Amino acid sequence: VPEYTVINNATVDLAGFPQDKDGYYVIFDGKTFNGWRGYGKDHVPSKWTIDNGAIKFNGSGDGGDLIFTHKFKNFELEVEWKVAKGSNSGIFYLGQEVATTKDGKQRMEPIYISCPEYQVLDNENHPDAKLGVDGNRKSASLYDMIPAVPQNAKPYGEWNKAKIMVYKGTVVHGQNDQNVLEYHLWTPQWTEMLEKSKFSPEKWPLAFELLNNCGGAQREGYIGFQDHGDDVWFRNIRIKVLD
């Protein structure tokens, strides 16, 4: 349970983002990075680019995770995602910006110790596919806790549809228009899933604390995308706030 700080940085208003006919805010205009910032940074990392109306991570600028600068709570996110052959990325939700102080200097902690990830992956050609228990490291899974069933991912190079819903602590992941798992935050079963994971209280104290109390006191958090050194695209990014 170390000394941790949560950084509070400016969040944009949703008013600035148009809403579509079904009520979903469009938080990527297909042309610009308005509303987006690199986690732990004051600027869009340069390996993130706009390619053909997609946000794209240029594998091989500075890198790091990219977030949208609005804290969501009850919401339904929809995204399309394409990976290149062997690509790894992911979609983060309820994230917090965290720092610890070691040796009098502030250091950024990764977003994945504060919040869940919906993995993004070429399941056919990437070694993480093999590496969990029961596929919990293949695409759409809650990475290293809960597998996606069914695993209806398309082959690399194609656009996949992702849904992440969080409603009053209930979470559902969607892939290509099926719901593929469900869990419940801030419960003992949640506590348990964490004790089985790499975020176990013994294997990683500060992660367990943040994940068990996911979304802080106010249960709200940033959405974002993972830099994991590989080529990936996202587009049609929209989010409905829930009422």
Ligand SMILES: [Mg+2]
């Ligand atoms: Mg990943």
